[PDB]
């Protein structure tokens, strides 16, 4: 339970750092079930509510 708890938290973070056009928004919208750690209660369920809810200057100085 806890092994996959930390695994799933790490994977949620990893997909979060993956900016996509089909990113974890689709995962989360169906991840209303379970996307965080769950061992028995407490910091488990709380975790749910924690996550369930020069050329550059040319870019920055010619069109910002």
């Amino acid at each position: 339970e806890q092994r996959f708890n930390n695994f799933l938290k790490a994977l949620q973070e990893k997909v979060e750092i993956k900016q996509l056009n089909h990113f974890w928004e689709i995962v989360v919208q169906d991840g209303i079930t379970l996307i965080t750690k769950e061992e028995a209660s407490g910091s488990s369920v709380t975790a749910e509510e924690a996550k369930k809810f020069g050329g550059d200057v040319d870019d920055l100085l010619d069109m910002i």
Binding site: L61, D62, M63, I64
Partner: protein, 82 residues
């Protein structure tokens, strides 16, 4: 000649003269002596008038001269300075 008058030019006349010479300088910004001397003049006339007052086109123009310094005969260093 030109630097003195540009330093003492009336700011209002500066505006319409700038509007007149915008494209005339932009196009020309892009033996060997003729071009580099003309660009000498262009830099030394535009700088003083930028020193007066502040669209979007200008945002490009600056870098059109930035590389003009970063090249890797003394007229070349004078060009970089201008």
């Amino acid at each position: 000649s030109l630097l003195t008058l540009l330093w003492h030019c009336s700011l209002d006349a500066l505006r319409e003269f700038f509007s007149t010479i915008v494209v005339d300088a932009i196009d020309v910004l892009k033996t060997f002596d003729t071009q580099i001397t003309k660009k000498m003049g262009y830099y030394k006339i535009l700088d003083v008038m930028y020193s007066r007052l502040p669209n979007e086109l200008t945002k490009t123009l600056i870098k059109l001269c930035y590389d003009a310094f970063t090249e890797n005969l003394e007229r070349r260093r004078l060009y970089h300075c201008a």
